[PDB]
Amino acid sequence: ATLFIADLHLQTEEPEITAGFLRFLQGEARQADALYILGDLFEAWIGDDDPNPLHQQIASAIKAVVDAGVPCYFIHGNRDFLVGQRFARQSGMILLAEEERLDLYGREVLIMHGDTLCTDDQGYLAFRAKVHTPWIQRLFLALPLFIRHRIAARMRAEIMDVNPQAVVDAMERHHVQWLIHGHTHRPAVHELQANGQPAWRVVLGAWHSEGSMVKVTPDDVELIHFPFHH
Amino acid sequence: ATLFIADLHLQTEEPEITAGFLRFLQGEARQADALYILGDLFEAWIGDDDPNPLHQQIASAIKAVVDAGVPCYFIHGNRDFLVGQRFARQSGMILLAEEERLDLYGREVLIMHGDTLCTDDQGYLAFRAKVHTPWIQRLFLALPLFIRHRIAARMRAEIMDVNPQAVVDAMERHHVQWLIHGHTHRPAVHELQANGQPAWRVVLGAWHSEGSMVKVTPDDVELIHFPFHH
Ligand SMILES: Cc1cc(C#N)nc(N2CCN(S(=O)(=O)c3ccc(NC(=O)c4ccccc4N(C)S(C)(=O)=O)cc3)CC2)n1
Ligand SMILES: Cc1cc(C#N)nc(N2CCN(S(=O)(=O)c3ccc(NC(=O)c4ccccc4N(C)S(C)(=O)=O)cc3)CC2)n1
Ligand SMILES: [Mn+2]
Ligand SMILES: [Mn+2]
Ligand SMILES: [Mn+2]
Ligand SMILES: [Mn+2]
């Protein structure tokens, strides 16, 4: 089985979500062929040089999974787009592109965070375009850490769902009948049409009282919710 | 594993849902310790004497599961409250009460359809009280089938969510930390408090483009959505 998760929004303020994630990495994840994390692993990221102890606890847990023989992969979310090659090295995770077309036991699946599909949000997309410009990233990252923290705090003081056409267009660009994403925090299986055939869009949930994952096997694709009852 | 499903709303008009259900009974269900169907198996029911061919195709498929060594159980929904002992015999299913407290590998779980929790719907509950009165049922069922059909058709020409307090009260009456239901067609895992401890309410989805089930093992409880991709 290949596993997909997203929208953990991990942070110092929410230790119970972190514990649920650590339990998942130590249990479920070890049995998998691979683990894909489709963005918003962290609630925020201002650079890999951040000494936040949570960051190292998380990289250390993911690295254990990778070292146990289960490749882990990452696609950036809107929250954690500044996750970089240094974290990748610490965690053993491989950074992937904003869209990837996978071959899962012969089934072709498109994966992404899902924020790019939300084309009705002009505000978000203007923001995204700027923070995805390399020289704007390298500017922000060249500031002293204490100034990056002030910038984030000052920003602080509902997520728009996908545009249906944008979904079709993406599945048609990749010629696939399967899409897995998060971002929208609306866990669901959807049926549609793409490439003249039936297609499915499987949406992951955010981690709060529950976790969620998509499990892909040779014959099946399942969206699973689990409570943190341990 | 023990499996829970609900809200299939099976009907002549929707053969693709019926095929998804038959595939599930022939595959997934055969591997289980038991199968519980928590109501709204059928979109409508006007009595067991109805010769609708769908009714016999469904009973025959469920009976195969029971005969293969997997007990099947049923709790009535609002739609199919007139399902009776004759169908039970045809299907091999055991009829259970509107609330049951189960022991699943040491875990105590409350199961029900969920309509009784929806105490904000005065209209529904007035209806329910009447159609659950035995002598009102036996009156309706004593009519000729052709008159029962007219009555249903004439009735034809959104589902209220649960009352949060009603949920707590039910879990507290049974002294349980686990509740599984359907009815509301809002598949989700919810955390709450009952009996002074953390509790979980696991809600099944309706079958249309997807199926859903709750899988209970010694150590885990999972809500699973599956598309009908075969
Ligand atoms: C390179 C660059 C330049 C400048 C500078 N100066 N600033 C930064 N960020 C880095 C990321 N951090 S963050 O992690 O705390 C963060 C903060 C806000 C968002 N905002 C959004 O994602 C967003 C924006 C618009 C509309 C919707 C949005 N999301 C959907 S939402 C509702 O979750 O916030 C994302 C990450 C804030 C500072 N980066
Ligand atoms: C014993 C008795 C007496 C009389 C007579 N005369 N009539 C009957 N029924 C049997 C059931 N059939 S049914 O299966 O077609 C059916 C029809 C309507 C409902 N209505 C509701 O469930 C309902 C009613 C009020 C508010 C909400 C409701 N549901 C939530 S909903 C929106 O799904 O319909 C249920 C079953 C209709 C006739 N039974
Ligand atoms: Mn998110
Ligand atoms: Mn996001
Ligand atoms: Mn229903
Ligand atoms: Mn119902």
Author numbering:
A (entry chain A), B (entry chain A): 2 to 158, 170 to 242
The authors write:
Since the pocket accommodating ring 1 is very lipophilic, the introduction of polarity here while retaining good target affinity was a challenging task. Optimization of the π–π stacking interactions between ring 1 and Phe141 led to a library of substituted heteroaromatic compounds. As expected, the introduction of polarity here was a trade-off between lipophilicity and target binding. Nevertheless, to our satisfaction, many analogs showed significant improvements in serum MIC. The best compound in this group, EBL-3339, showed only minor reduction in MIC activity upon the addition of serum while retaining good target affinity. The X-ray structure of the complex of EBL-3647 with KpLpxH shows that it retains the binding mode of the original hit compound JEDI-1444 (as well as EBL-3339), with both protein and ligand closely superimposable.
